[PDB]
């Protein structure tokens, strides 16, 4: 591919799922890839898999880790173009008297503030490049989710980062950007389902939630991220959704 | 009552349904209300039954009859301080191919002109008191709705002139906002459920799209009325969402 | 290019712009190209230029010209894609008191039901291909502008009217997506900024009303709806921004 | 007053400012309001001047402080039915490149968490009571602000976990909204204000983001939030803004 070619991107979590599919993108793109993430065994494989992806394992709620993440990049290809936070997690659900404040501070320190410290190490060389950032958010950030009041809390909380990093960055020309999507369909997605009474029947309901009628794949987040990085030179601080329309209409969820 | 006692309101489709309730809210409020109406049968009982309220025959879509509701208004009571766009339809559902451009336009004459009228013919009027205006629009303007291309466009730029127009009063002090409301139990929505194959069904449908399980009514709608017209001060072009909340999470509406 | 190989699209107001730049954009793309346009000097020239662009004279207030657009279409071609809904207009400023519902009605017939008669005309042939509709609407419809109700008004119909659409095609996997631009120099800017009492100043506040400091380009809103044709395959309702970011943070627009 | 008569609320961060404005707002009602603050200065006179409210010392950043705000309220009152999650703090402007990741969790300690556990310590009280949640957030969660990337978070979050948490609550009939002010003079806009290099420049820019040209008034806030306990019966999960329109139309914040 020639859309990013000579562009050098990072990845978190790309070693499965959402985040793999990403990975694939842009190496499809022309990019070399630096995939981070806390767990070796999906990463370490699409490396031998991708030519021009490269594994560094590296827990991004660690800031040695990130720093040498950046370093790393930095010293083995030159530059740095893209950086995406995708690396996050979601609880099993959750009502809102079993959760901790502790369990919400550990949430908030992968999803948000992970996703911050890692921007705030590249900016210094996105800015040399004119590069930008994506942040992997998530649709319930913005119309909520039953069950899930730390995850929620901290994807809204990065939907509203982005938007304020992108108002800093932009005398810059860095751009910042962040992904919502929807009901994806990938190994998380199955851990989940696989907790319920029914995972089959929850399966389905999560393919009902959209009127395209199934979940998406981690290659159309990929297509989306791509797309961000290379030829979307006039959008920052938007909230691309990515979510089969499951935020349209009316759906279940006389005036006593 | 006195949040907004010696204020005089005009509420267009005021005969039944959330029109009725707003009339109602207001005079409670100690407001004295013209009720505005294309049919006699609500609108004059409601005249009698309340003191404080007066029932006009106007059809909004008649621009020599709003020319009269607003002389008629301040012939007989000196001022205007609020004017409530409600008059409005909601065709029966129909397929985008079972649409006509003609249906179309008839739909924006009632839903957006006639509140366009109203307004523009009233302005003067509200320069002077500091009034204010107050569109009835809906939520499915915001998320969309299905079986109603035509009247989701309505309310789509219902909302967004609301915005347009509280941007250019906002230098004269009068403010403009929005109510979108999302299923609230009316006689409309009564005839639409009675043309279903199943009524009772689609009643209760339309209760459980709601996390509060059940509709609206008409007198929460009106008490979001009262509250913009006599003390949202500082809010202007905001839309005020009425809706159980039907916007909040997934519903019914693998990755192949 | 390759990433919309062997697809038809058709776009209108296709002559200039916006609507130039996506012609481009899809030719570049693998495309072949309708542009449609109620002017022949831009298009003309246009089909010239460009090997796989063809311009079909056509007036979308008109509906027999569109009937023949599609038809056209189809017979020259043989299958339809990707219809993009770009032609429009902003009339220039005018205060509320200085518009007419007539003046409205007018441009609600180019900016929404222009849109809404190619898009019904040409859904039987996007339900064969699986392909997409894509309207151009405005950032304005979401956010107000000054002195452009009847504009603004018509953009958050088009906004709402592609939502609701949306959710009717779904069954069919026809996606319903827009792209809402904000300030994009064109020769309609270029025509309205002269109109003012200083043209050079109208266009430097219009540079800086985006914090990226420039205007948009229609190369990029062309990048951005061959995204949502090609590579946004779980992308329906969506409002896509291309803007810059003027919609974030505050900007020039103690307690008395 | 008696649209809130019988009701106890509990306002935090009510010893100044916009929870000053809330406490009045709610003691005109004819509720019974327990002030809390960390500070004793403002709460402490606030609970001489007004019959029918008291003071209560507690830092909502410490556990144990404000389960004691919950039993002594309970104690002394005997019922619970609203709270205000109002405490919260924006830092000095501070670019991206000067924040610590240790600062933005102090930020969201106080923003966020507390917020966070008096709610969840109240519902219990609130489910027996049919009470509601009112959390104060910011417009700048929804649109971005410069220099305020921790700020701009933590409002981020509070605003999508008022959703999260409307959604689990309505089965139990307990409502759950937020508002969203913008520029309100209050103690902390006029501190922050002689921070900068001109302080009288800075609160005219202030003024002017606003269309209604004037900052908004902790009263008016006030206003809001007794609505949303007292009168908002069907709303749960919204964001009502009281922004004096600052999210609107385009400001100051060739393609090239
Ligand atoms: N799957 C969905 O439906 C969905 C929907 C919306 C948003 N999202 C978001 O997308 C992202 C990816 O989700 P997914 O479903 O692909 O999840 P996943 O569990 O399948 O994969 C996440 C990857 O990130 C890695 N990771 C986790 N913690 C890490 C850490 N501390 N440091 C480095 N790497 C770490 C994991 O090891 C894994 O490889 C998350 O931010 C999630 O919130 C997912
Ligand atoms: N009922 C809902 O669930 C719902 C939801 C969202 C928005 N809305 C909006 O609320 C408004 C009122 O709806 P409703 O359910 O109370 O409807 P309704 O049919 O019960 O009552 C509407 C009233 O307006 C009058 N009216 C209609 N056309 C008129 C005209 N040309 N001139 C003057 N009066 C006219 C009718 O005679 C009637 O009295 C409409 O704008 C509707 O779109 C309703
Ligand atoms: N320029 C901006 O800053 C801006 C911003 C947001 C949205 N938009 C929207 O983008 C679209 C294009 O705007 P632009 O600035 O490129 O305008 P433009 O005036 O430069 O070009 C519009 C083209 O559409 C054609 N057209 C107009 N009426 C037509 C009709 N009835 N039938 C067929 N073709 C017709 C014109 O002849 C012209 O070629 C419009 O929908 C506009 O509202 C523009
Ligand atoms: N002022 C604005 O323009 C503005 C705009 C949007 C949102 N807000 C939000 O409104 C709220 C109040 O802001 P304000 O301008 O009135 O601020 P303020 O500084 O004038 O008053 C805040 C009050 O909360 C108290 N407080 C702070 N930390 C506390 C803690 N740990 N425990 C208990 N009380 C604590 C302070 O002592 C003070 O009495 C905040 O959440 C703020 O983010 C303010
Ligand atoms: C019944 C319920 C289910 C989930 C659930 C189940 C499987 C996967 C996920 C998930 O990882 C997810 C799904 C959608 C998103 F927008 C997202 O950011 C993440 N969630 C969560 C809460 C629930 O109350
Ligand atoms: C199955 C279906 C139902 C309706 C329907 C049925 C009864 C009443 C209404 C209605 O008057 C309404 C309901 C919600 C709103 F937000 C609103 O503005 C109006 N609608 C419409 C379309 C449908 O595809
Ligand atoms: C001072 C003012 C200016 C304009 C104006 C000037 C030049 C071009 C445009 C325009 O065509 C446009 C600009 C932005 C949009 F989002 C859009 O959909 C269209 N508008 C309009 C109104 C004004 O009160
Ligand atoms: C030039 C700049 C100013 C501020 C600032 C100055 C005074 C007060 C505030 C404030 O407390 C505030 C203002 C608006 C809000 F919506 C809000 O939640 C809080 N902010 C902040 C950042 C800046 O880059
Ligand atoms: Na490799
Ligand atoms: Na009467
Ligand atoms: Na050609
Ligand atoms: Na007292």
Not at 13 to 17: A, K, L, S, T
Not at 231 to 237: D, K, L, M, Q, R
């Given at each position: 591919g020639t859309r990013y070619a000579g562009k050098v991107v990072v990845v978190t979590?790309?070693?499965?799922?959402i985040g793999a599919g990403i990975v694939r993108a842009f190496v499809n793109s022309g990019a070399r890839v630096v995939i981070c993430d806390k767990d070796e065994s999906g990463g370490r494989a699409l490396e031998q898999e991708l030519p021009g992806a490269v594994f560094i394992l590296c827990d991004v709620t660690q800031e040695d880790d990130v720093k040498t993440l950046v370093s790393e990049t930095i010293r083995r290809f030159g530059r740095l173009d893209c950086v995406v936070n995708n690396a996050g997690h979601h609880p099993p659900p959750q009502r809102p008297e079993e959760t901790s404040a502790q369990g919400f501070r550990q949430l908030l320190e992968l999803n948000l503030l992970g996703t911050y410290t890692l921007t705030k190490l590249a900016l210094p060389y996105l800015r040399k490049s004119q590069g930008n950032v994506i942040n992997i958010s998530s649709l319930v950030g913005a119309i909520g989710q039953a069950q899930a009041v730390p995850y929620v809390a901290t994807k809204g909380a990065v939907t509203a980062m982005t938007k304020a990093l992108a108002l800093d960055e932009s005398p810059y020309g860095v751009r910042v950007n962040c992904i919502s999507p929807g009901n994806i369909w990938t190994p998380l997605w199955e851990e989940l389902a696989a907790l319920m009474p029914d995972p089959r029947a929850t399966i389905r309901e999560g393919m009902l939630a959209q009127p395209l009628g199934r979940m998406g794949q981690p290659a159309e987040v990929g297509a989306a991220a791509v797309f961000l990085a290379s030829?979307?030179?006039?959008?920052?601080?938007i909230e691309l959704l990515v979510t089969?329309?499951?935020?349209?209409g009316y759906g279940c969820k006389p005036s006593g």
């Open positions: 979590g790309g070693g499965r799922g030829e979307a030179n006039f959008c920052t601080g089969g329309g499951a935020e349209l």
